[PDB]
Structures are given as structure tokens and as C-alpha cells.
Design an enzyme around this catalytic site. Sequence first.
Site, PDB file in Angstrom:
ATOM      1  N   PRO A  73       0.844  -1.210   0.000  1.00 46.90           N
ATOM      2  CA  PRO A  73       0.000   0.000   0.000  1.00 46.90           C
ATOM      3  C   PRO A  73       0.866   1.242   0.000  1.00 46.90           C
ATOM      4  CG  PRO A  73       0.103  -1.035   2.222  1.00 46.90           C
ATOM      5  CD  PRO A  73       0.715  -2.016   1.231  1.00 46.90           C
TER       6      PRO A  73
ATOM      7  N   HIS B   9      -5.015  -0.819   8.337  1.00 45.43           N
ATOM      8  CA  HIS B   9      -3.719  -0.166   8.541  1.00 45.43           C
ATOM      9  C   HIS B   9      -3.509   0.041  10.035  1.00 45.43           C
ATOM     10  CE1 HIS B   9      -0.253   2.211   8.398  1.00 45.43           C
ATOM     11  NE2 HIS B   9      -0.510   2.973   7.347  1.00 45.43           N
TER      12      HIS B   9
ATOM     13  N   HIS C 141       2.866   2.037  11.452  1.00 42.03           N
ATOM     14  CA  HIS C 141       3.527   3.339  11.130  1.00 42.03           C
ATOM     15  C   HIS C 141       3.135   4.547  11.993  1.00 42.03           C
ATOM     16  CE1 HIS C 141       3.876   1.083   7.040  1.00 42.03           C
ATOM     17  NE2 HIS C 141       4.754   0.654   7.911  1.00 42.03           N
TER      18      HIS C 141
ATOM     19  N   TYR D 234       0.208   5.505  13.159  1.00 45.10           N
ATOM     20  CA  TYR D 234      -1.136   6.054  12.875  1.00 45.10           C
ATOM     21  C   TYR D 234      -2.098   5.665  14.013  1.00 45.10           C
ATOM     22  CZ  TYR D 234       1.187   7.735   8.703  1.00 45.10           C
ATOM     23  OH  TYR D 234       2.038   8.385   7.849  1.00 45.10           O
TER      24      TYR D 234
HETATM   25  N1  LIG Z   1       0.613   5.889   5.064  1.00 43.00           N
HETATM   26  C1  LIG Z   1       1.772   5.267   5.546  1.00 43.00           C
HETATM   27  O1  LIG Z   1       1.730   4.247   6.204  1.00 43.00           O
HETATM   28  C2  LIG Z   1       3.078   5.935   5.191  1.00 43.00           C
HETATM   29  C3  LIG Z   1       4.331   5.076   5.407  1.00 43.00           C
HETATM   30  N2  LIG Z   1       5.644   5.539   5.314  1.00 43.00           N
HETATM   31  C4  LIG Z   1       6.726   4.882   6.047  1.00 43.00           C
HETATM   32  O2  LIG Z   1       7.257   5.986   7.064  1.00 43.00           O
HETATM   33  C5  LIG Z   1       8.534   5.739   7.261  1.00 43.00           C
HETATM   34  C6  LIG Z   1       9.350   6.994   6.829  1.00 43.00           C
HETATM   35  O3  LIG Z   1       9.246   7.203   5.422  1.00 43.00           O
HETATM   36  P1  LIG Z   1      10.359   8.150   4.643  1.00 43.00           P
HETATM   37  O4  LIG Z   1       9.996   8.332   3.197  1.00 43.00           O
HETATM   38  O5  LIG Z   1      10.499   9.470   5.375  1.00 43.00           O
HETATM   39  O6  LIG Z   1      11.787   7.396   4.884  1.00 43.00           O
HETATM   40  P2  LIG Z   1      12.437   6.047   4.180  1.00 43.00           P
HETATM   41  O7  LIG Z   1      11.617   5.692   2.942  1.00 43.00           O
HETATM   42  O8  LIG Z   1      12.520   4.888   5.138  1.00 43.00           O
HETATM   43  O9  LIG Z   1      13.928   6.597   3.820  1.00 43.00           O
HETATM   44  C7  LIG Z   1      14.543   7.570   4.619  1.00 43.00           C
HETATM   45  C8  LIG Z   1      15.962   7.653   4.020  1.00 43.00           C
HETATM   46  O10 LIG Z   1      16.522   6.471   4.176  1.00 43.00           O
HETATM   47  C9  LIG Z   1      16.840   5.909   2.698  1.00 43.00           C
HETATM   48  N3  LIG Z   1      16.771   4.471   2.597  1.00 43.00           N
HETATM   49  C10 LIG Z   1      17.163   3.788   1.507  1.00 43.00           C
HETATM   50  N4  LIG Z   1      16.985   2.482   1.741  1.00 43.00           N
HETATM   51  C11 LIG Z   1      16.485   2.362   2.982  1.00 43.00           C
HETATM   52  C12 LIG Z   1      16.124   1.249   3.709  1.00 43.00           C
HETATM   53  N5  LIG Z   1      16.170  -0.169   3.351  1.00 43.00           N
HETATM   54  N6  LIG Z   1      15.643   1.398   4.946  1.00 43.00           N
HETATM   55  C13 LIG Z   1      15.511   2.642   5.476  1.00 43.00           C
HETATM   56  N7  LIG Z   1      15.865   3.741   4.753  1.00 43.00           N
HETATM   57  C14 LIG Z   1      16.349   3.590   3.511  1.00 43.00           C
HETATM   58  C15 LIG Z   1      15.932   6.452   1.943  1.00 43.00           C
HETATM   59  O11 LIG Z   1      16.413   6.530   0.574  1.00 43.00           O
HETATM   60  P3  LIG Z   1      15.285   6.596  -0.592  1.00 43.00           P
HETATM   61  O12 LIG Z   1      15.104   8.009  -1.066  1.00 43.00           O
HETATM   62  O13 LIG Z   1      13.898   6.050  -0.323  1.00 43.00           O
HETATM   63  O14 LIG Z   1      16.059   5.827  -1.624  1.00 43.00           O
HETATM   64  C16 LIG Z   1      15.694   7.864   2.515  1.00 43.00           C
HETATM   65  O15 LIG Z   1      16.547   8.767   1.981  1.00 43.00           O
HETATM   66  C17 LIG Z   1       8.911   4.519   6.377  1.00 43.00           C
HETATM   67  O16 LIG Z   1       8.878   3.350   7.092  1.00 43.00           O
HETATM   68  C18 LIG Z   1       7.783   4.551   5.324  1.00 43.00           C
HETATM   69  O17 LIG Z   1       7.752   3.259   4.602  1.00 43.00           O
HETATM   70  C19 LIG Z   1       5.676   6.831   4.356  1.00 43.00           C
HETATM   71  C20 LIG Z   1       4.646   7.704   4.658  1.00 43.00           C
HETATM   72  C21 LIG Z   1       3.179   7.117   4.410  1.00 43.00           C
HETATM   73  C1  LIG Z   2       5.479   6.906  -0.912  1.00 48.69           C
HETATM   74  C2  LIG Z   2       5.147   5.829   0.104  1.00 48.69           C
HETATM   75  C3  LIG Z   2       3.852   5.780   0.530  1.00 48.69           C
HETATM   76  C4  LIG Z   2       3.456   4.778   1.415  1.00 48.69           C
HETATM   77  N1  LIG Z   2       2.143   4.756   1.866  1.00 48.69           N
HETATM   78  C5  LIG Z   2       1.751   3.719   2.679  1.00 48.69           C
HETATM   79  C6  LIG Z   2       0.392   3.586   3.047  1.00 48.69           C
HETATM   80  O1  LIG Z   2      -0.515   4.258   2.522  1.00 48.69           O
HETATM   81  N2  LIG Z   2       0.061   2.542   3.874  1.00 48.69           N
HETATM   82  C7  LIG Z   2       0.994   1.746   4.463  1.00 48.69           C
HETATM   83  O2  LIG Z   2       0.621   0.830   5.226  1.00 48.69           O
HETATM   84  N3  LIG Z   2       2.305   1.851   4.114  1.00 48.69           N
HETATM   85  C8  LIG Z   2       2.654   2.842   3.261  1.00 48.69           C
HETATM   86  N4  LIG Z   2       3.990   2.898   2.907  1.00 48.69           N
HETATM   87  C9  LIG Z   2       4.928   1.869   3.394  1.00 48.69           C
HETATM   88  C10 LIG Z   2       4.965   0.814   2.248  1.00 48.69           C
HETATM   89  O3  LIG Z   2       3.733   0.074   2.167  1.00 48.69           O
HETATM   90  C11 LIG Z   2       6.004  -0.298   2.450  1.00 48.69           C
HETATM   91  O4  LIG Z   2       5.908  -0.806   3.758  1.00 48.69           O
HETATM   92  C12 LIG Z   2       7.444   0.105   2.250  1.00 48.69           C
HETATM   93  O5  LIG Z   2       7.452   0.962   1.096  1.00 48.69           O
HETATM   94  C13 LIG Z   2       8.181  -1.223   1.958  1.00 48.69           C
HETATM   95  O6  LIG Z   2       9.541  -0.942   1.847  1.00 48.69           O
HETATM   96  P1  LIG Z   2      10.144  -0.852   0.360  1.00 48.69           P
HETATM   97  O7  LIG Z   2       9.811   0.529  -0.133  1.00 48.69           O
HETATM   98  O8  LIG Z   2      11.640  -1.010   0.631  1.00 48.69           O
HETATM   99  O9  LIG Z   2       9.577  -1.942  -0.477  1.00 48.69           O
HETATM  100  C14 LIG Z   2       4.376   3.885   1.987  1.00 48.69           C
HETATM  101  C15 LIG Z   2       5.687   3.961   1.559  1.00 48.69           C
HETATM  102  C16 LIG Z   2       6.056   4.960   0.652  1.00 48.69           C
HETATM  103  C17 LIG Z   2       7.516   5.040   0.230  1.00 48.69           C
END
Ligand SMILES: NC(=O)C1=CN([C@@H]2O[C@H](COP(=O)(O)OP(=O)(O)OC[C@H]3O[C@@H](n4cnc5c(N)ncnc54)[C@H](OP(=O)(O)O)[C@@H]3O)[C@@H](O)[C@H]2O)CCC1
Ligand SMILES: Cc1cc2nc3c(=O)[nH]c(=O)nc-3n(C[C@H](O)[C@H](O)[C@H](O)COP(=O)(O)O)c2cc1C
Length: 365
Positions: free
Chosen positions: A22, A176, A179, A181
Site C-alpha cells: 500500500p 492499517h 507506522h 497512525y
Molecule cells: N501511510 C503510511 O503508512 C506511510 C508510510 N511511510 C513509512 O514511514 C517511514 C518513513 O518514510 P520516509 O519516506 O520518510 O523514509 P524512508 O523511505 O525509510 O527513507 C529515509 C531515508 O533512508 C533511505 N533508505 C534507503 N533504503 C532504505 C532502507 N532499506 N531502509 C531505510 N531507509 C532507507 C531512503 O532513501 P530513498 O530516497 O527512499 O532511496 C531515505 O533517503 C517509512 O517506514 C515509510 O515506509 C511513508 C509515509 C506514508
Molecule cells: C510513498 C510511500 C507511501 C506509502 N504509503 C503507505 C500507506 O498508505 N500505507 C501503508 O501501510 N504503508 C505505506 N507505505 C509503506 C509501504 O507500504 C512499504 O511498507 C514500504 O514501502 C516497503 O519498503 P520498500 O519501499 O523497501 O519496499 C508507503 C511507503 C512509501 C515510500
Amino acid sequence: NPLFSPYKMGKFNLSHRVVLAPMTRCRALNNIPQAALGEYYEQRATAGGFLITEGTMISPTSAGFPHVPGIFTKEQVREWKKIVDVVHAKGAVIFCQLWHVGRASHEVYQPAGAAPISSTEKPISNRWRILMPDGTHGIYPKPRAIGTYEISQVVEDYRRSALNAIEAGFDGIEIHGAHGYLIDQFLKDGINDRTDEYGGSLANRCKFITQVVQAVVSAIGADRVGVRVSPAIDHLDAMDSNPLSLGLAVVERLNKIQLHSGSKLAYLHVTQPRYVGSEEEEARLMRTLRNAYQGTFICSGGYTRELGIEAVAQGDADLVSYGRLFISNPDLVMRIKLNAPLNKYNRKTFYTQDPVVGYTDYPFL
Ligand SMILES: NC(=O)C1=CN([C@@H]2O[C@H](COP(=O)(O)OP(=O)(O)OC[C@H]3O[C@@H](n4cnc5c(N)ncnc54)[C@H](OP(=O)(O)O)[C@@H]3O)[C@@H](O)[C@H]2O)CCC1
Ligand SMILES: Cc1cc2nc3c(=O)[nH]c(=O)nc-3n(C[C@H](O)[C@H](O)[C@H](O)COP(=O)(O)O)c2cc1C
Ligand SMILES: NC(=O)C1=CN([C@@H]2O[C@H](COP(=O)(O)OP(=O)(O)OC[C@H]3O[C@@H](n4cnc5c(N)ncnc54)[C@H](OP(=O)(O)O)[C@@H]3O)[C@@H](O)[C@H]2O)CCC1
């Protein structure tokens, strides 16, 4: 390649184990699913593949991002039906993720500029900022702590949205619960400071997620309900003092719902942290939740082709969901099958509003 061995997820015969995680993308202008979403999910759909939608609103107070779709109105149901239809025409299975952000909101996202709701009055700290509609970043405000009656009305919003998803033709819904929420604001003892029946002990902290899952199970059937959690992810100041214990406590409640209802859930979906030992400790946490849970397990968080193959081969998961790589690779399933190069993704257009740019214009092989 074990990612391409078939998997029976309840009634669904999946042809491979690569799942679209998602992902909020903010193209559903004014919370209405748009034709662009249909194109985007169609691009990623495969015959026998499983897709989970971006988080979808369950009520007017449930949002903390701009232009996220809802499924709480009949108008939203009508637009979602068109998207479900194009996905089903490609032979894919699709679940709608039901998302309430709780305190991770802002006055701009709330009706009448009201305070967001939570388990607590504690705000997210200033180390995290919220994306605003104009593209800047703002300050998370103090939420309002809800009472037991209002909790029951939030549960009813999940129930009504689950019914609406089924009306739109979705194969099921995902709760959900991850994260940082709303549900995680009740689960995590770093947030939940309540002294009533929803706070304190593990059982009390698990009450809200149990009530939400039970309500949707009783509305649409356990087979059409998946649950997503992230006990060891600390996003938005959502930490637990003992993530493995919290995770097992959640699993215990899910297994009990299944026994009482007479039916398994569709799956448990868990996102793990990735740190750059911690990787082995985290792998053991994931394996322990999988071993404890009676049913299908979807792992997520930092997976690659190689790590997904290993997870399935080793028995650590049944299905593997991919997020960021699926943003930039519409044909990610085929690229994983062929061990083809992957397109780079552009974070700058993760949450922008254009129906094409950074959304449907990443190229196929
Ligand atoms: N609705 C939801 O549930 C949402 C979930 N989200 C989750 O919140 C958390 C924070 O999201 P984020 O976009 O602020 O951070 P993240 O995607 O984990 O990356 C933060 C920095 O670490 C980098 N990063 C490169 N690999 C990795 C790697 N395996 N591990 C953790 N960092 C990495 C990553 O590089 P990328 O630009 O994505 O390439 C980025 O610069 C994540 O767990 C995300 O999945 C996004 C918001 C909506
Ligand atoms: C742009 C973005 C939006 C996301 N929105 C959701 C969300 O709506 N619901 C949720 O459960 N996780 C959300 N996630 C977390 C992703 O479902 C997923 O756990 C994470 O992207 C998996 O790691 P990967 O990007 O290395 O495959 C989001 C992640 C990103 C980067
Ligand atoms: N086909 C791909 O490349 C893909 C990358 N993906 C991700 O898409 C995102 C966009 O890629 P990006 O160019 O905007 O950011 P990044 O991968 O972090 O690299 C930034 C710059 O540093 C360069 N760079 C690279 N590795 C190094 C290094 N070890 N030392 C120093 N400089 C380096 C790198 O050169 P390459 O384009 O990779 O040749 C690039 O010019 C990244 O998060 C990336 O992890 C998805 C998977 C496939």
C-alpha cells in the site's frame, strides 16, 4: 525462483508471491478516486498477482495527507468500482487499505480545522513535520484524546468503510495498524498513556485493534480481512518498550478472533525496520511473529529480489510486498522474474498531484 511458485491465499490462487505494498501517492484529488489511479493500478496488475491500495480514508477526520482517496461515501464507491474493474480485468486480486492517521494530521486536513483525534493528548514531536497541501512542511498539533463512546464510533467508521469496499467490488480490505497512525497510537506504550480500559496492560493496548478487526470481520467475513502492523518501526514517535512482546500480543488476539469466528483472516502483514546484529535480531522478530500467527504472512520493508527469494525459500513469509521499487517499476513482477534492471524512483514525485508525471510515466521493459 520461489517468488514464482503459486500460493493459495484462502480462496485466491495467486500465481506468484510479489505483492504491491500500500502506498499513499496523493493523486486522488479532493479524496475522490481519479481515472489516474485506474491507470496506475492497471499498469502494476498481473494475472494472479495481489495488490493492496494506498491508505484510504474511513471518515472525514481520518486524513493527514492531501488528496488521499476515501471510501466512506457512496460517491467514492462509484469511482473505486471503475478502478477495481480494470484491475480484475487483468486477473489480479485487490484489497483496499483502510487508514486513519489519528494524531498525524493538521488543522488543514480536518473539518472546521478541528484538532485530530488520538489515544492521547500528546503530539508528535517537532522532529517530524507534516506535508501540507501547498508542498511545504508544517507542525503536528496537539490531538484530542477520545473516549470509549467515540472509539466505538471510529470502529463503526471502519465497519462502514469495509462494507463500502465490498460494494465497490474489492476482494477484501486491509486494516492499517502500523507506522504510528491511529491504531498504533493505541498499541504502542510510548504513546498510549491512558488509564482506562484502553491503556496500560498489553491486553488493554490491544483492545482497539481487536475491536476494529472484530467489527470488520463481522461485517464482511474474516476471509476478506487482512491486518498490517509494525511493532518495531518507530515512525512518528511511535515506540514500544518491548516490540517482540507487543507483536506477539497482537498475534495472540488475531489467532483468537480466528478461532472464535471459525475462519482465518486473509493474512497478517508486517513491516520491519532496516538499519544500515540488528538485521539478524529483526529477522528473528519477523520469524517469531510468522511462527506464532496461524495463517498467511506477508513481509515488507526494504525487500529486494534476493531478500524476497530468501524469505520465501526459508519459510519466513508466504508473500513479499514491495513499495518503492513498485513506484518506479510498473512491471516489477516481470522484472523480478527475469532478473532485469530496475528503474530508479524519484522521491520528489511520491506525493505530488499530477496524474501522469512520476505516477504512470515510469517505463516498462
Ligand atoms: N501511510 C503510511 O503508512 C506511510 C508510510 N511511510 C513509512 O514511514 C517511514 C518513513 O518514510 P520516509 O519516506 O520518510 O523514509 P524512508 O523511505 O525509510 O527513507 C529515509 C531515508 O533512508 C533511505 N533508505 C534507503 N533504503 C532504505 C532502507 N532499506 N531502509 C531505510 N531507509 C532507507 C531512503 O532513501 P530513498 O530516497 O527512499 O532511496 C531515505 O533517503 C517509512 O517506514 C515509510 O515506509 C511513508 C509515509 C506514508
Ligand atoms: C510513498 C510511500 C507511501 C506509502 N504509503 C503507505 C500507506 O498508505 N500505507 C501503508 O501501510 N504503508 C505505506 N507505505 C509503506 C509501504 O507500504 C512499504 O511498507 C514500504 O514501502 C516497503 O519498503 P520498500 O519501499 O523497501 O519496499 C508507503 C511507503 C512509501 C515510500
Ligand atoms: N537502476 C538504479 O540505479 C536503481 C536505484 N534505485 C533507487 O532510486 C533512487 C534514485 O536514484 P538517485 O540517482 O536519484 O540517488 P542515488 O542512487 O542515491 O545516487 C545518487 C548519485 O550518487 C551515485 N552513486 C551511486 N552509488 C554511489 C556510491 N557507492 N558512491 C558514490 N556515489 C554513488 C549515483 O551514480 P549512478 O547513477 O548510480 O551511477 C548517483 O549519481 C535511489 O534511491 C535508488 O536507490 C531503485 C533501484 C534501481
